[PDB]
Structure formats: C-alpha cells, structure tokens
Design a protein around this ligand. Structure first.
Ligand SMILES: Cc1ccc(C(=O)Nc2ccc(CN3CCN(C)CC3)c(C(F)(F)F)c2)cc1C#Cc1cnc2cccnn12
Length: 268
C-alpha cells in the first residue's frame, strides 16, 4: 500500500526474542513472541544461504510444512519467523513418549503426515535433501510438520545413515534420494527413535548397502510398512516409489488402524 511495502517483512521490534531452543541443537533458533498478537513464534537468525531459505519458504504452504509467518531481511540482524511447534522435534518426542499415547496408529499417522508434505514438495519440484526425524516438528495431538534446520553428520558434512547410495557415491540428490531418507525415517519412527544401522559403523555402510544389505524389520513393525521401507531402499532411484504412492499407502493403513484404535478406546 506504500512504495517500500513488502508483505513478508516484519519489523524486528514486533518480536520479543527469548531463549535459544533445544540447548542450541537447532542452531540459532529462538523462542520469541510476536508482541502485536501475542502469539509465541520461533525465530531463526544469522547470508545468501539465509536469503535463499527465506525465498524458498515464501514458496511453500502446506499443512504439514512448518509455516512461515514473516522475515526481517531488509537489514541485519536477519530474521525468519515461523509458527511455533510446541513438542519440539520428532526424534526426541519419540524417545521420550508414552507409547500408550503414541500408539501404533499414531506411528502411522506420523508417517502419513510426513509423506503428505513430501508429496507436496514432490509436486512442487522441490528436494528436501535432509529428511530425518531430527528435522520434523511435533505439535498438539501428534501434529507433525517437516522442517529443515540446516544442521550439517560426518564434499561437505553428511548424515551418512540417511543418505542414498547415488548421493554418497556420486553426489546425485533428488526427490528419490528423499524417498530413501524417508525410508530411514520410517525405521526411526518404528523403533521410537533408535539410531539407524545399530552396531554397524559408518565406514561400512555403503559397501554393505551395495552388497544389498538393508536394515531388518524392527520388532513390531507391520509387514507392509517394512515392505514400504524396503521399496524406499531400492538401489536404483528410479525403482523407488513416489511420495504420492507412499502417502496413498500410509493414509490407507492409517484409516484401517484408527477403526481399531477408536474401538479399543471405547472398550477401555
Ligand atoms: C524459525 C525457523 C525457520 C526455518 C525453519 C525451517 O524448517 N526452514 C525450512 C527451510 C527450507 C525448507 C524446504 N527446502 C529444504 C532445502 N531444500 C534443498 C529445498 C527445499 C523447509 C521445509 F519445511 F519445506 F522442508 C523448511 C524452521 C524454523 C523453526 C522452528 C520451530 C518451531 N517450533 C519449534 C520447536 C523446537 C525447535 N524449533 N521449532
């Protein structure tokens, strides 16, 4: 409505900055308040990389993707402001949870939400590049959203154990290498937050994958979920399923599971 108006730009003074989140495990991400509307938010601060992230996020709007609310990118300090997710990241949520609440149908629900955001990124021709539980956020009622904290892990630093063969070997990243990562995510969900390839050391992973070794079905993981895990770990990226197919599968499993859980809830 005026010459220097930008619909994404907030004023730094709109925001009360509070503590850094997660002991600093997320990097420069703070809790903050958008004082106008009260509202607790999260605020990442710091440069091109930062500007790219802001520019990408403006392009992304989906129920299971952490929602951008504003940026402060006119002058330093640079801010990105997103909605706040009250239970923190998925990996720790799983490690700490009451499995009476975080039951089997919830695990399927978590998987359905994540595949749903990824199908969205797939349709939009984006590539996440670092999909993992540590990168998903949890809110109320097992709401899960996909994020990215640019956390890089061992070219660069790599999360070796979530990384597709063609990405480790040839540096080829794609939505199909996300599909492979999503498969490790499934295993993380299935174990409630166990480290992948337990007991195996990082230097051996590729060679083992190339001999066609894959992680075994976790105790209690449904057969069909494992089927999905292993389809995600097809060696040829072209052989992997789409996130559209993946999300379709999990929704269906999810709906079947809740009929059972609700019923079980009634009886108890
Ligand atoms: C302040 C903040 C800023 C940014 C982001 C963020 O995730 N950025 C993001 C950047 C890019 C992409 C997509 N690209 C990936 C790369 N790829 C190469 C291209 C496509 C996506 C994605 F969600 F779409 F994946 C997200 C999260 C937060 C948070 C927070 C928050 C809220 N509640 C809590 C509770 C505890 C801890 N943190 N926290």
């Amino acid at each position: 409505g005026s010459p220097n108006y930008d619909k994404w730009e907030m004023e730094r003074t709109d925001i009360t900055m509070k503590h850094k989140l997660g002991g600093g495990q997320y990097g420069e991400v703070y809790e903050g308040v958008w004082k106008k509307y009260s509202l607790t938010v999260a605020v990442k601060t710091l440069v091109e990389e930062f500007l790219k992230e802001a520019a990408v996020m403006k392009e992304i709007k989906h129920p299971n993707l952490v929602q951008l609310l504003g940026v402060c990118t006119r002058e330093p300090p640079f801010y990105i402001i997103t909605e706040f997710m009250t239970y923190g990241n998925l990996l720790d949520y799983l490690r700490e949870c009451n499995r009476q609440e975080v039951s089997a149908v919830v695990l399927l629900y978590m998987a359905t939400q994540i595949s749903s955001a990824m199908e969205y990124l797939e349709k939009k021709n984006f590539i996440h590049r670092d999909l993992a539980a540590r990168n998903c956020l949890v809110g109320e009622n097992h709401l899960v959203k996909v994020a990215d904290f640019g956390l890089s892990y061992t070219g660069a630093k790599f999360p070796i154990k979530w990384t597709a063969p063609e990405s480790l070997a040839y540096n080829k990243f794609s939505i199909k290498s996300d599909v492979w990562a999503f498969g490790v995510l499934l295993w993380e969900i299935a174990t409630y937050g166990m480290s992948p390839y337990p007991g195996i050391d990082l230097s051996q992973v590729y060679e083992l994958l190339e001999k066609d070794y894959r992680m075994e079905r976790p105790e209690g993981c449904p057969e069909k979920v494992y089927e999905l895990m292993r389809a995600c770990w097809q060696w040829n990226p072209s052989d992997r399923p789409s996130f559209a197919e993946i999300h379709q599968a999990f929704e269906t499993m999810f709906q079947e599971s809740s009929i059972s859980d609700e019923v079980e809830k009634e009886l108890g």
